[PDB]
Design a protein around this ligand. Structure first.
Ligand code: NA
Ligand code: NA
Lengths: 331, 329
């Protein structure tokens, strides 16, 4: 008659934006449910397994998790494509895909076999390319590069001879400080500056690899089923709402912090990969997508949905948003 | 105790996207509250007053409404700025403004004095510039032009010599047909084609004047306060959610319908106002913004907040999203 659930999240405690999304979700559920369902959150400082969230929720040890789908590529490579993909969709496009273009259904197709329900957990919007010790001037500079980079982008850089890793949010600055890694990408101005990377890595590259990173709420299938229908709805709605508000917050904080970056950080050197490097990355991505499609029918089905939907909705984005933003004045 | 409410909407019945947003909200409230709060929706065919929604809600004749804030230009000029503004913010920028940048609070400053609570009610995304009988090649061509065009955009057109109006959704075609107006804007590919404008006015201009139209839920203050706190939250969350989903839906359907537009409506001729005309519209909007700000301290404050927040958030949009889109193609 009264439910007490626990949520495990990848992030350190009191982590802004990402931790706000899980917090906001839990507060809404309590408030809408007059306390019938309440959700206590354990961050990485507590459960000490930032990348164990999938297992926590699969087993039922936590009813819920907040994390990112593409962290679970080991469990199932198809988990990569429900977060974001290189050269993929923007957040408005991707939210359309999830809720109106078949994405939610495809995600369930992957996650049902684990007894996990996955839901969008909040979008960062467009991400940066990351923080580097040394500039990337040629493809050869990626060879043996120790870079923290998750998801399919990680796969792509491995294909080009890099040495990618997935170090979780709270340990990133330390890994770079000790030279465990020599480059990293995290998110963008909204979180990267308070996390301190610029102190060690002067070069801040523009992105390509995460155009709209969607985080993930995960729910144990049995816990969800243990709920009455009205609370089930409160839960799913609160997650969707928290996810959307996080994109709003990320956009807000990116505005605040790009501004700080263009005035309070004279030693940050904003850079873009040279075109020959982008062409090489683009080709490796396209080739690797083909490989992944050819080797599994479900992978092939997801990538075809992503590609097809992007082609349709991007034409509108180009026609509308992009043209609006590119508009100028002569004279 | 059970709460049985009514919502009045501006739109006709089974109106795609806009009407989906109000139904989604009502359905969410019913399901989350296990029937404790249910909301019957009355469309314009039933209450017969498409632009009577403000007064319906103010009076409490209806507990709620779904409409757009800039229709109430005549009851308070400041209501225009909580829908969208010419050369203004995109939807992701504006949601950030509403929820994290002070927009909600500013909107409440305006609506509180009418016993109404106003909330974001769904964004269309970027709108087209409208449907025209004749191409617009010079500023001159706007002079005398009778056009249906709402909100602050109408005021920019009037300043350049056009004659704006605001007719309800339902009689635009007829008004176009009987040469009452010679041009109009409505929304975009998601909703425009089914209205039939293209049969009479084949030139379809790209936009500038409604970069991110946010619809509006209104709630009677007394009605809102009659609710216990958990149903109040269910209600506010439902509106917020329905609003965000409508932007996702609008994006989806804009994509679907743009793809089909060339094939299925070969007589539509896509156009963009000439650069000298845009320069003039731009100057005109800049001028009117100053003029409107000088008339009223609250207006100046609303406009200063939008200007300031947009400057900050657009810098990001250009640095990130636009650069990314231009990086392909
Ligand atoms: Na990232
Ligand atoms: Na419009």
């Amino acid at each position: 008659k009264k439910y007490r659930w626990r949520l495990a999240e990848t992030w350190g405690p009191n982590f802004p934006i990402f931790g706000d999304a899980s917090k906001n979700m839990a507060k809404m559920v309590k408030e809408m449910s007059d306390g019938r369902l309440t959700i206590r959150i354990d961050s990485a400082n507590k459960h000490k397994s930032a990348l164990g969230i999938f297992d926590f929720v699969k087993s039922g040890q936590y009813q819920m998790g907040h994390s990112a789908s593409y962290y679970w590529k080991g469990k199932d490579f198809n988990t990569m494509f429900f977060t974001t993909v290189p050269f993929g969709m923007t957040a408005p496009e991707q939210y359309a895909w999830f809720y109106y273009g078949g994405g939610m259904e495809l995600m369930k197709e992957t996650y049902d076999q684990y007894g996990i329900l996955s839901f969008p957990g909040g979008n960062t919007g467009v991400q940066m390319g990351g923080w580097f010790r040394k500039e990337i001037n040629t493809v050869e500079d990626l060879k043996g590069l120790k870079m923290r980079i998750p998801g399919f982008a990680g796969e792509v850089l491995a294909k080009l001879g890099a040495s990618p890793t997935n170090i979780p949010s709270a340990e990133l600055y330390t890994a770079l400080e000790r030279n465990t890694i020599d480059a990293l990408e995290w998110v963008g101005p909204s979180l990267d500056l308070r996390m301190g990377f610029h102190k060690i890595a002067p070069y801040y590259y523009t992105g390509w690899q995460e155009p709209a990173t969607e985080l993930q709420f995960m729910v144990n299938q049995k816990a969800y089923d243990s709920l009455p229908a009205d609370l089930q709805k409160i839960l799913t709605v609160a997650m969707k709402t928290a996810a959307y508000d996080m994109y709003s917050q990320s956009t807000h904080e990116n505005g605040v912090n790009l501004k700080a970056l263009q005035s309070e950080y004279p030693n940050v050197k904003i850079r873009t990969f040279p075109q020959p490097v982008m062409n090489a990355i683009r080709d490796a991505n396209d080739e690797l997508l083909a490989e992944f499609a050819a080797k599994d029918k479900e992978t092939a089905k997801i990538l075809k949905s992503i590609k097809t939907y992007q082609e349709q909705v991007r034409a509108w984005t180009k026609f509308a948003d992009q043209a609006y933003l590119e508009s100028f004045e002569s004279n």
